Design a protein around this ligand. Structure first.
Ligand SMILES: COC1=C(OC)C(=O)C(C/C=C(\C)CC/C=C(\C)CC/C=C(\C)CC/C=C(\C)CC/C=C(/C)CC/C=C(/C)CC/C=C(\C)CC/C=C(\C)CC/C=C(\C)CCC=C(C)C)=C(C)C1=O
Ligand SMILES: CCCCCCCCCCCCCCCCCC(=O)OC[C@H](COP(=O)([O-])OCC[N+](C)(C)C)OC(=O)CCCCCCCCCCCCCCCCC
Ligand SMILES: CCCCCCCCCCCCCCCCCC(=O)OC[C@H](COP(=O)([O-])OCC[N+](C)(C)C)OC(=O)CCCCCCCCCCCCCCCCC
Ligand SMILES: NC(=O)C1=CN([C@@H]2O[C@H](COP(=O)(O)OP(=O)(O)OC[C@H]3O[C@@H](n4cnc5c(N)ncnc54)[C@H](OP(=O)(O)O)[C@@H]3O)[C@@H](O)[C@H]2O)C=CC1
Ligand SMILES: CCCCCCCCCCC[C@H](O)CC(=O)SCCNC(=O)CCNC(=O)[C@H](O)C(C)(C)COP(=O)(O)O
Ligand code: SF4
Ligand code: SF4
Ligand code: SF4
Ligand SMILES: [Zn+2]
Lengths: 209, 145, 342, 155, 115, 96, 176
């Protein structure tokens, strides 16, 4: 083929996903802020944080959407943004074999309505976002640490949190106990500054400000 | 018929291993009594047998040497007693024994395959292999003041 | 200081402290605890041992990898001591034995071995040697333990003039042979105090206090030559002390006066054992000596460490001895044994 | 002579300990899978006298196979405490040895030695079941070289 | 702009009410931790530590923050109640093995190059 | 060649030897200081300098893919011998 | 295409039900289960006689790290630090300094076996085939510190396993 290395591009899927994006935008103009289809045929809907319960429910119950499986629910922390936390919902429709992305934003001290009522799979996921990042989800059946150790102080996945943490563990014979001490590494993590000072992709060139 | 031949070759088991004494020697040392063609022997004394009839995994084997590098290995043996040249043939990584195909020789290659030196006072102790970075002022000797 | 003995870090495991030390007799009670503190601040310990290396296993996980180093040594071999103390700033002597083994009497482990340690340490060039004795150390005490300790102190002082001598009174802790001794005395009927134990006054000192005192004395630049006395904060009457020990353990207390010579015979009978001699004549004697108060000698408070009263740290020692019945009772359930005022 | 008698008693007791090493079912991560493969027919722990047994009360050697994290370390230390003596700890894999891949993480103990006294360090990520068998045999020789009653005789 | 969503409480007084009842639960709990967890610290020696933990973050004034630490303290109480924390986890509050750190400038200058 | 420091410690090819007044030597007693006797500094010295009859010459270290990346050395200065930067082999023009 | 794994309704003929009742009363599939294990006991065991018999490997096997050297004697390593820059676990520490002759060689090349993940990325990254993963895997140590490899220990490994490593690379370099 003329492009043996370039990944093949499908445009029919692009048209279908764009049509459904316009469909969802027209259906719920109250919350849908911005919809876009990526070059690799993935549709993302950016909604207002108040539209977490409604929009998802629509995508779960409408005949033309039928997204009945919360594949993944995660958050991305971008400190340079006002509302740094960026909650991502990945949904899969088995009837129309299609994947959708609903992405909302939230700062440190703003709650998000728990989607446990709509997607009962979210119940554990939400806790993870609470544990890793600190986004508090109101109206949750039980919010607790799910991954960090008991008595952990902080949210590890936050960018403003060292990868080695602040406290290490040890066994002390004087107290006969697994005590916790301030972290002290034998060899510090060598931070490599690997980033070419030459612009890589002209397509994603931010206009000057 | 096969019962008689089966009882018989159990006597070839004791005949091959230098009689009864060698039979119990290999039985108590290597826990097996099976015989095999002597593929070779290394300078340390380990004997290296092969039998292609055995299923893949036991077609080749070692009877370890009684003595290596000032250590009695009659009763205690380990997998580090294999010289590097023959470790390839033993682990089925090649079909060429060192007797037929000998590995290329070079000056820096060792001439005495030391086993696992853990435990013995010939252990390995990590240490910094670099010199100092900051020097001192080495104050002068004249009282002067 | 050498280029590698300059203190570095924040006192954690992987911090250069500069307290490269040898602790003779580390495999037991305070020898463990001291190492822990030496391991905690990040000091390279050259722990020697004569026992099976397996018994040194609990010594392994208190220092950063590469810090703690184990060596074989023999008491009657100057070369071994020279090997272990050749490269060390401090040499702490913790060698001792509550009994007299066949190959080692009291003099061997309290005079001969400390003499060899002090002489070899002085020859090598160490700067500090912390020797450990008993508070009730007297050349005329009936127990050979204290007499041998006294002559050993004099010899160590002669060999190492600037050697810090620490005289703890009585160590109580999780493995102390002092509180566990009284607790285990329940098996042999009642507790047979000599003259009902109403004349002996004991001043027990917490193990952590003693180990921290050793560490501070190492860090203190004025501990050289001095002779400290590590004692507890209160002075307990022996009968009241056993009362408290059995109250915290909630075991029944059956005091029984016992003639001195009969208890000596009992000590001999227990000495017969070719294993750990539960009780010796020296042992039954020592529990009857009072703790000689020595106000002239400097104490723990001078080093900057406040003695912890036995009441707070008695539940740790005796919680094992309690049956399932009083296994969960709190620390304040039993009221502190009355103490004769110092 | 007494030295010969205690020597022979040492050989007998050490032989028993080394020939009936009962390990514990304490697999934690991928290093447990090799811990199973040497229990698989090919290598077969059983012929060497070693048979898996849970309930630490009746086990001798702990093969810490897998990453030891902060949330699990108290459990591992406690469980090591349950083992009646003599006890041995074999550390499988780089994670249980010194930290492995996640040595710089926030919830990983940087080596199992910081919690229990590890007796044999088996390297690998994961170690080949042959390598773990070699580590177990090295521990076996270690028990063979014990001198308990000799030291007791020279108390 | 200056006005934003609330977490649970709609004023500082309700946040203080929640802090009060959280302290109620902790103070009632403490002896149960001392007994059940087989702790060796005295009952008061845990109650004052609860008081000190409450007094640590006594400077915060944003209500939403106060509700956030109310939830976090509720979670820690939840862990302490159904033996989810262990003896070591609880004992971490009393920093025991940590050597005391100095506060005066002179000792810090004597010990190392840090602020 | 490996030689002995005044303390007794063998110096490595990197010139590393703990000072007499250094506590770190404690780690080496009852053990040995692991050093490599085959010194690369010496071993490359006696390798004969090849009399290449061209102005420039290509070195790959021998064995093609087994060696180092192939580099071209310019043999023009008569006062020195061109030495490959990867393996250390020298080359020289035939008396120019 | 899909198949119904369990959609079989049992026949209700008198013979079928008699057979089912016979299997219930006179345990039949249970006897089959016994027979299978009887058949495998009479079969040959698969255990190999370690350490006298070793499980098969391949020339690509990743084991103990080792530093190779040229046939002349000079080390292959030139301290380009690709292996240190590519190790996923940051297990390599390299310090370089121009030698007396002039060639750039590591004044320190430490690989931490207790932190290594044995990925082999270093041996791919090396442009001179200096660092390799040797065939050795039976190098367990009784103490942790013995697993912190120095430059001297790695050079000793290279000089010890050179006979095996040279053959292993000779039988695999064409695939790379
Ligand atoms: C999905 O992810 C998963 C993980 O992901 C990370 C995991 O981690 C894990 C967890 C990992 C594991 C569980 C590890 C994997 C474990 C296994 C695969 C198990 C493998 C087990 C085996 C190979 C062994 C199985 C055992 C067998 C077949 C048999 C055992 C039976 C025995 C009998 C053993 C022997 C024991 C005993 C006690 C017998 C010996 C005693 C005697 C002979 C006593 C004799 C005494 C005398 C003769 C006395 C005589 C006295 C006399 C004559 C007189 C006395 C009188 C006097 C007065 C003195 C899992 C499960 C997992 O799923
Ligand atoms: C209550 C007290 C009761 C006391 C009863 C008296 C006897 C008790 C102890 C009996 C064994 C003592 C130890 C000597 C044997 C031994 O274990 O040797 C191990 C040692 C172990 O050596 P090893 O450690 O080199 O073996 C493992 C390593 N490989 C496999 C590589 C060799 O082996 C021998 O000594 C060889 C003995 C071979 C013959 C053994 C007996 C065969 C006949 C048994 C018949 C049935 C008897 C029932
Ligand atoms: C039928 C069985 C026949 C053989 C029975 C052997 C029983 C051995 C039990 C363990 C050894 C105990 C002994 O004799 O002395 C303990 C001796 C006592 O000497 P020790 O002073 O080293 O004490 C050991 C260390 N502590 C006290 C901490 C336990 O120790 C050892 O043997 C292990 C070292
Ligand atoms: N209440 C108390 O116990 C008090 C004790 N002290 C002194 O403190 C020191 C340590 O006490 P503690 O830790 O409780 O004692 P332990 O008996 O618990 O430990 C004594 C240590 O000395 C070693 N040791 C004994 N004899 C010899 C010998 N001949 N050769 C080599 N090593 C030997 C032991 O080795 P191993 O373990 O192998 O036997 C062990 O390491 C002793 O000097 C003691 O008298 C001072 C005041 C009070
Ligand atoms: C140790 C073993 C047990 C296990 C561990 C036991 C301790 C666990 C503690 C968990 C709770 C957490 O630390 C604290 C929290 O959530 S909130 C603290 C109070 N902080 C505020 O409310 C902010 C403003 N502060 C005030 O307004 C005043 O401080 C006060 C409230 C006193 C009112 O005073 P006025 O009225 O005078
Ligand atoms: S050492 Fe490697 S194989 Fe073992 S648990 Fe860690 S990452 Fe997994
Ligand atoms: S093979 Fe080992 S040394 Fe090489 S990059 Fe991987 S972990 Fe690091
Ligand atoms: S990649 Fe090879 S040549 Fe480069 S520093 Fe590492 S070992 Fe040396
Ligand atoms: Zn070259």
């Amino acid at each position: 083929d003329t492009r043996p290395t370039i990944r093949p591009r499908n445009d029919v899927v692009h048209k279908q996903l764009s049509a459904f994006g316009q469909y969802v935008a027209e259906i719920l103009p109250k919350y849908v802020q911005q919809v876009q289809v990526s070059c690799f045929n993935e549709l993302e809907i950016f909604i207002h944080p108040d539209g977490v319960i409604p929009v998802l429910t629509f995508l779960r119950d409408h005949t033309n959407a039928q997204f009945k499986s919360l594949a993944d629910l995660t958050a991305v922390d971008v400190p340079t943004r006002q509302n740094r936390f960026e909650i991502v919902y990945n949904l899969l429709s088995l009837r129309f074999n299609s994947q959708i992305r609903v992405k909302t934003y939230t700062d440190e001290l703003t709650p998000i309505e728990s989607s446990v009522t709509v997607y009962k799979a979210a119940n554990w996921y939400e806790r993870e976002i609470w544990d890793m990042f600190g986004v508090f989800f109101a109206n949750h059946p039980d919010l607790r640490r799910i991954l960090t150790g008991y008595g952990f102080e902080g949210h590890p996945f936050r960018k403003d949190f060292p990868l080695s943490g602040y406290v290490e563990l040890r066994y002390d014979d004087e107290v006969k106990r697994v005590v916790a001490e301030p972290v002290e590494l034998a060899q510090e993590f060598r931070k490599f500054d690997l980033n070419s000072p030459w612009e890589a992709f002209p397509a994603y060139r931010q206009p000057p400000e | 018929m096969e019962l008689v031949q089966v009882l018989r070759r159990g006597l070839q088991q004791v005949s091959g291993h230098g009689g009864l004494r060698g039979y119990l020697r290999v039985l108590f040392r290597a826990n097996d009594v099976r015989v095999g063609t002597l593929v070779g022997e290394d300078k340390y004394g380990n004997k290296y047998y092969e039998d292609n009839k055995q299923f893949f995994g036991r077609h080749r084997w070692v009877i370890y040497t009684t003595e290596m590098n000032g250590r009695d290995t009659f009763w205690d043996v380990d997998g580090s007693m294999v010289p590097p040249e023959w470790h390839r043939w033993l682990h089925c990584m090649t079909d060429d024994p060192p007797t037929t195909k000998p590995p290329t020789a070079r000056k820096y290659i060792w001439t005495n395959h030391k086993f696992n030196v853990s435990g013995t006072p010939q252990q390995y102790v990590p240490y910094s292999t670099t010199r100092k970075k900051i020097q001192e002022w080495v104050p002068p000797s004249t009282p002067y003041k | 200081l050498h280029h590698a003995l300059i203190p570095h870090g924040k006192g954690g495991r992987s911090s250069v402290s500069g307290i490269v030390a040898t602790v003779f007799g580390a495999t037991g009670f305070l020898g463990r605890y001291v190492v822990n503190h030496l391991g905690r601040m990040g000091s390279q310990v050259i722990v020697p041992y004569r026992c099976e290396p397996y018994d040194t296993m609990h010594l392994r996980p208190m220092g950063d990898l590469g810090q703690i180093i184990f060596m074989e040594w023999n008491g009657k071999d100057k070369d071994s001591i020279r090997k272990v103390v050749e490269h060390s700033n401090v040499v702490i002597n913790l060698v001792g034995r509550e009994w007299e083994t066949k190959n080692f009497d009291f003099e061997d482990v309290f005079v001969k071995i400390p003499h060899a340690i002090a002489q070899v340490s002085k020859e090598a060039g160490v700067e500090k040697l912390i020797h450990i004795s008993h508070l009730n150390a007297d050349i005329k005490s009936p127990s050979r333990y204290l007499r041998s300790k006294a002559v050993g102190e004099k010899e160590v002082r002669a060999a190492f003039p600037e050697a810090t001598i620490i005289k703890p009174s009585d160590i109580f802790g999780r493995e102390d042979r002092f509180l566990n001794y009284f607790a285990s005395m329940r098996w042999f009927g009642g507790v047979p105090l000599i003259s009902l134990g109403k004349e002996t006054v004991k001043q027990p000192v917490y193990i952590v206090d003693v180990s921290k005192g050793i560490i501070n004395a190492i860090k203190d630049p004025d501990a050289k030559g001095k002779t400290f006395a590590f004692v507890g904060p209160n002075r307990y009457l022996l009968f009241d002390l056993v009362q408290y020990i059995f109250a915290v353990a909630y075991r029944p207390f059956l005091p029984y006066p016992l003639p001195h010579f009969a208890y000596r015979w009992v000590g001999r009978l227990f000495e017969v054992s070719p294993f750990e001699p539960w009780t010796t004549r020296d042992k039954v004697e020592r529990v009857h000596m009072s703790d000689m108060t020595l106000p002239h000698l400097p104490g723990l408070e001078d080093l900057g460490i406040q003695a912890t009263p036995l009441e707070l740290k008695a539940i740790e020692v005796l919680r094992r001895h309690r049956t399932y019945r009083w296994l969960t009772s709190e620390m304040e359930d039993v009221k502190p044994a009355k103490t004769v005022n110092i | 002579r007494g030295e010969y008698v205690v020597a022979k008693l040492d050989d007998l007791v050490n032989w028993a300990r080394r020939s009936s090493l009962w390990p514990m079912t304490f697999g934690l991560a991928c290093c447990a899978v090799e811990m199973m493969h040497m229990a698989a027919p090919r290598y077969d722990m059983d012929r060497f006298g070693v048979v898996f047994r849970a309930s630490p009360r009746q086990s001798d050697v702990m093969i810490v196979a897998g990453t030891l994290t902060n949330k699990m370390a108290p459990a591992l230390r406690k469980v090591y405490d349950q083992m009646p003596e003599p006890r041995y700890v074999v550390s499988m894999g780089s994670c249980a040895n010194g930290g492995g891949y996640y040595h710089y993480s926030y919830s990983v103990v940087r080596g199992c030695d910081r919690i229990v006294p590890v007796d044999i360090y088996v390297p690998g990520c994961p170690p080949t079941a042959e390598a773990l068998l070699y580590g177990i045999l090295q521990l076996q020789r270690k028990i063979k070289r014990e001198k308990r009653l000799r030291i007791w005789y020279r108390r | 702009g200056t006005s934003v969503k609330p977490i649970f409480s709609r004023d500082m007084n309700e946040a203080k009410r929640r802090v009060r009842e959280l302290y109620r639960a902790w103070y009632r709990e403490v002896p149960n931790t001392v007994h059940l967890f087989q702790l060796d610290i005295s009952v008061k020696q845990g109650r004052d530590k609860v008081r000190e933990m409450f007094m640590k973050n006594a400077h915060v004034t944003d209500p939403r923050v106060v509700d956030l630490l109310v939830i976090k303290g509720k979670m820690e109480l939840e862990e302490t109640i159904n033996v989810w924390k262990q003896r070591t986890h609880i004992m971490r509050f009393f920093h025991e093995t940590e050597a005391p750190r100095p506060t005066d400038f002179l000792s810090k200058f004597y010990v190392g190059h840090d602020p | 060649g490996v030689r002995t420091s005044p303390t007794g410690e063998k110096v490595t090819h990197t010139g590393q030897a703990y000072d007499d007044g250094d506590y770190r030597r404690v780690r080496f007693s009852d053990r040995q200081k692991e050093v490599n006797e085959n010194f690369a500094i010496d071993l490359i010295a006696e390798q004969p300098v090849s009399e290449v009859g061209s102005r420039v010459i290509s070195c790959d270290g021998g064995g093609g893919a087994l060696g180092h990346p192939r580099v071209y050395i310019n043999l023009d200065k008569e006062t020195k011998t061109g030495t490959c930067g990867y393996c250390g082999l020298q080359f020289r023009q035939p008396h120019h | 295409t899909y198949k119904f794994v369990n959609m079989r309704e049992p026949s209700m003929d008198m013979k079928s039900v008699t057979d089912r009742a016979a299997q219930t009363l006179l345990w039949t599939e249970l006897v089959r289960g016994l027979g299978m294990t009887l058949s495998y006991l009479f079969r040959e065991p698969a255990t190999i006689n370690y350490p006298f018999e070793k499980g098969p490997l391949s020339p690509r096997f990743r084991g103990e790290h080792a530093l190779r050297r040229y046939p002349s004697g000079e080390e292959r390593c030139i301290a380009c630090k690709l292996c240190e820059a590519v190790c996923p676990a940051q297990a390599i520490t390299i310090e370089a300094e121009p030698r007396a002759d002039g060639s750039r060689r590591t004044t320190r090349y430490d690989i931490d076996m207790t932190k290594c993940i044995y990925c082999g990325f270093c041996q791919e990254a090396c442009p001179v085939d200096a660092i390799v993963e040797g065939p050795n895997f039976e190098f367990s140590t009784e103490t942790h510190e013995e697993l912190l490899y120095n430059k001297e220990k790695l050079l000793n490994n290279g000089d010890k396993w050179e006979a095996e490593i040279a053959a292993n690379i000779q039988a695999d370099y064409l695939y790379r």
